[PDB]
DNA sequence: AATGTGCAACAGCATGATCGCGGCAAGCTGATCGTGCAAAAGTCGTGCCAGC
RNA sequence: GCCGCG
DNA sequence: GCTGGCACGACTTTTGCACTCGTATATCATGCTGTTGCACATT
C-alpha cells in the first residue's frame, strides 16, 4: 500500500544527519535548508534579470 | 484526588510487593533506603562516587 | 535524596584540559527550579537556569 | 604599512555503554463530530397453499 | 516499571 | 376440518455523502562539524 501526500514532503532519513547529503549536494548550509523547509525563509530560483 | 492518591500508592516506582520469605525479609524490606526514584536517580545515570 | 539547599562543586577539574578547577554552585529548591553559577576558563562568571 | 587568507580553539550534536534466566501488577489503555436525504436494504404485520 | 538469579 | 411454513404492501433501519467548525534534569567518553579568533604573506 501507499499513501499520496498531495504535498511533497522532505526525508528526515537524508536531511538530518551530520554528514547531510542533501545540504552539501546543494552546496549550502544544513540551517538554510532547514529554515526554507519549515516555512522560515523563501528561496528563489533564476531570476537573472 | 483519589485518582493522585491511588496512582501513587498502587503503580509508583517506591511501592513494590513486599517481600514475604520468613519475618527477616520483611523486616528488612520495610526498613530499606533506595537511591532511586521520581526524585532521585536513575541507575545508568550514577557514577563510581555514588 | 539531596536535600534542598546550597552545593558548591568542583568537577574535579579536568573539563577543559588546561588544569583549571572551575567551581560551580548550585541553588536546589523543594519545588521548583534550580539555579547555577558557573566559570568560564576565561575567567566569566555564568548563570544557567533550569 | 594596511590588507586578505588559511589554520586552530571552543561549542554543540550524534552514538553507545554484556549475556542468558526467573516472577508481579498496572497500564495496554482511546473515541473526529453530526448531516438529513435519497437510495437502498431490510423488516414486520399480514395473507397464501400444502400436510396431517 | 520493579525485584532477584549466574 | 385442523394446522404450519412461504410471499406482499407498507414501515423502519442503514449508509454514502463529503462538508465544515472546531514538566524536566545530575552517566561519562569519543568523534565530528561549524563559527570565530589570530598569525603570515601581499600591494
Redesign the pocket.
Known amino acids: 500500500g501507499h499513501i499520496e501526500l498531495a504535498s511533497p514532503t522532505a526525508h528526515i532519513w537524508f536531511l538530518?544527519?551530520?554528514?547531510?547529503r542533501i545540504?552539501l549536494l546543494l552546496d549550502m548550509?544544513?540551517?538554510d535548508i532547514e529554515r526554507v523547509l519549515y516555512f522560515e525563509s523563501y528561496v528563489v530560483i533564476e531570476g537573472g534579470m | 484526588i483519589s485518582a493522585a492518591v491511588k496512582?501513587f500508592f498502587?503503580?509508583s516506582?517506591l511501592s513494590?510487593?513486599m517481600?514475604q520469605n520468613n519475618p527477616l525479609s520483611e523486616i528488612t524490606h520495610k526498613r530499606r533506603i533506595?537511591a532511586?526514584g521520581?526524585?532521585?536517580?536513575?541507575?545508568?545515570?550514577?557514577?563510581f562516587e555514588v | 535524596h539531596?536535600s534542598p539547599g546550597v552545593f558548591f562543586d568542583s568537577d574535579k577539574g579536568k573539563t577543559?584540559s588546561?588544569g583549571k578547577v572551575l567551581y560551580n554552585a548550585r541553588i536546589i529548591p523543594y519545588r521548583?527550579?534550580?539555579l547555577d553559577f558557573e566559570f568560564?576558563?576565561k575567567d566569566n562568571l555564568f548563570v544557567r537556569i533550569?
Do not use: C, I, N, V
Request: aromatic share 6%; glycine share 16%; no cysteine.
Open positions: 538530518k544527519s551530520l554528514p547531510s545540504g548550509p544544513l540551517r | 496512582e498502587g503503580s516506582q513494590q510487593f517481600d533506595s532511586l521520581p526524585g532521585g536517580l536513575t541507575r545508568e545515570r550514577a557514577g | 539531596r577543559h588546561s521548583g527550579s534550580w568560564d576558563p533550569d
